[PDB]
Design an enzyme around this catalytic site. Structure first.
Site, PDB file in Angstrom:
ATOM      1  CG  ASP A 151      -2.342   0.966   0.725  1.00  9.24           C
ATOM      2  OD1 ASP A 151      -2.354   1.602   0.445  1.00  9.24           O
ATOM      3  OD2 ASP A 151      -3.357   0.498   0.425  1.00  9.24           O
TER       4      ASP A 151
ATOM      5  CG  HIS B 170      -4.846   3.990   1.342  1.00 11.57           C
ATOM      6  ND1 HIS B 170      -4.338   2.635   0.553  1.00 11.57           N
ATOM      7  CD2 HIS B 170      -6.489   3.742   1.410  1.00 11.57           C
ATOM      8  CE1 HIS B 170      -6.011   2.217   0.468  1.00 11.57           C
ATOM      9  NE2 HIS B 170      -6.820   2.645   0.659  1.00 11.57           N
TER      10      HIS B 170
ATOM     11  CG  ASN C 178     -13.540   1.604  -3.362  1.00  8.29           C
ATOM     12  OD1 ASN C 178     -14.210   0.468  -3.113  1.00  8.29           O
ATOM     13  ND2 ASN C 178     -12.694   2.315  -3.079  1.00  8.29           N
TER      14      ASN C 178
ATOM     15  CB  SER D 228      -8.840  -0.027   0.366  1.00 10.23           C
ATOM     16  OG  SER D 228      -8.861   0.538  -0.272  1.00 10.23           O
TER      17      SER D 228
HETATM   18  N1  LIG Z   1      -9.319   3.656   0.018  1.00  6.59           N
HETATM   19  C1  LIG Z   1     -10.787   3.798  -0.839  1.00  6.59           C
HETATM   20  O1  LIG Z   1     -11.122   1.987  -0.893  1.00  6.59           O
HETATM   21  C2  LIG Z   1     -11.633   4.354  -1.106  1.00  6.59           C
HETATM   22  N2  LIG Z   1     -10.908   5.761  -0.563  1.00  6.59           N
HETATM   23  C3  LIG Z   1     -10.609   5.346   0.939  1.00  6.59           C
HETATM   24  C4  LIG Z   1     -10.075   6.933   1.183  1.00  6.59           C
HETATM   25  O2  LIG Z   1      -8.619   6.742   0.978  1.00  6.59           O
HETATM   26  O3  LIG Z   1     -10.537   8.410   1.806  1.00  6.59           O
HETATM   27  C5  LIG Z   1     -11.367   6.983  -1.558  1.00  6.59           C
HETATM   28  C6  LIG Z   1      -9.625   6.692  -2.441  1.00  6.59           C
HETATM   29  O4  LIG Z   1      -9.046   5.503  -2.480  1.00  6.59           O
HETATM   30  O5  LIG Z   1      -9.461   7.243  -2.970  1.00  6.59           O
END
Ligand SMILES: NC(=O)CN(CC(=O)O)CC(=O)O
Ligand SMILES: [Ca+2]
Length: 279
Positions: free
Chosen positions: A39, A69, A161, A224
């Site tokens: 990640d 993240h 997503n 995620s």
């Molecule tokens: N992390 C996810 O699955 C989706 N989300 C979560 C975040 O990072 O707040 C948005 C993104 O990745 O742009």
């Protein structure tokens, strides 16, 4: 063991019904397992990781999580307060930059890195890899996730997503790995969750409290966030001896809560990740 007033997702994986607040789990807690979170990195200094986290690889000028993240995802795996497998060893592989982007070439290099690196680590209960990333369909990306799985690592990947069929995304569309969709605390499919025949299992993915950079915490949503619930569960079951890397996704689907979710499309599994823990 019991964690009182737990994040809903943790409570949800230890219950047959939505709306409960205690996370019940066996005290072994993933001890002797290892989970690679691939990640944006992991802030391993966060007190929530209790020294159980370390960066092992970065593909950028820093191994720091400048985004949050990867630290969030790692916390859902194995942080003391927010994690499914509270005694697991966490390893960070930074394939995503601090804006959360990464080239597929980099992501593939990260997967081949883990297939090798697990050989320099003490993981007597086994190895899991959690991939809360993806993009459009790539046979080379899917191939890399299949190698990782074949090398003896339980691979869990986000369905995506896009509120669309995951067949058109990678590594979600690789059949040999465990592809995870997202649900909310009312047992609905999350609004953004991908779906499709290739999904194996759902986990908690809407409004998920976990660790954040700067020693902090926050709630965010995405497939995620569901993926590390499943990754942590696999670590936990592997420590308990109830499954192995090769068979864990099957085991989790075998033992899931069935037909609890609403707004599941025809042809998508209605299975929610469940630990079958009996005090
Ligand atoms: N992390 C996810 O699955 C989706 N989300 C979560 C975040 O990072 O707040 C948005 C993104 O990745 O742009
Ligand atoms: Ca699969």
């Amino acid at each position: 063991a019991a964690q009182t007033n737990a994040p809903w997702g943790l409570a949800r994986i230890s219950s047959t019904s939505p709306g409960t607040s205690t996370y019940y789990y066996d005290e072994s807690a993933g001890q002797g397992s290892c989970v690679y979170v691939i990640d944006t990195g992991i802030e391993a200094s966060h007190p929530e990781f209790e020294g159980r986290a370390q960066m092992v690889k970065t593909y950028y000028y820093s191994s720091r999580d400048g985004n949050g993240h990867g630290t969030h995802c790692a916390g859902t795996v194995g942080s003391r307060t927010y994690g499914v497998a509270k005694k697991t060893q966490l390893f960070g592989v930074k394939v995503l930059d601090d804006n959360g982007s990464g080239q597929y070439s980099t992501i593939i290099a990260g997967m081949d890195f883990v297939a090798s690196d697990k050989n320099n680590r003490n993981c007597p209960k086994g190895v899991v890899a959690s991939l809360s990333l993806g993009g459009g369909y790539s046979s080379s990306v899917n191939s890399a996730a299949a190698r990782l799985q074949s090398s003896g690592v339980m691979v869990a990947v986000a369905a995506g997503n896009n509120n669309a069929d995951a067949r058109n995304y990678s590594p979600a569309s690789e059949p040999s790995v465990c592809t995870v969709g997202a649900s909310d605390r009312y047992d609905r499919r999350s609004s953004f969750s991908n779906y499709g025949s290739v999904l194996d299992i759902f986990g908690p993915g809407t409004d998920i409290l976990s660790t954040w950079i700067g020693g902090s915490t926050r709630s965010i949503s995405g497939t995620s966030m569901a993926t590390p619930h499943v990754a942590g569960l696999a670590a936990y079951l592997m420590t308990l001896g109830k499954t192995t890397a090769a068979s864990a996704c099957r085991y989790i689907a075998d033992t899931a809560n069935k037909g609890d979710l609403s707004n599941i499309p025809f042809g998508t599994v209605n299975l929610l990740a469940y630990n079958n823990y009996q005090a």
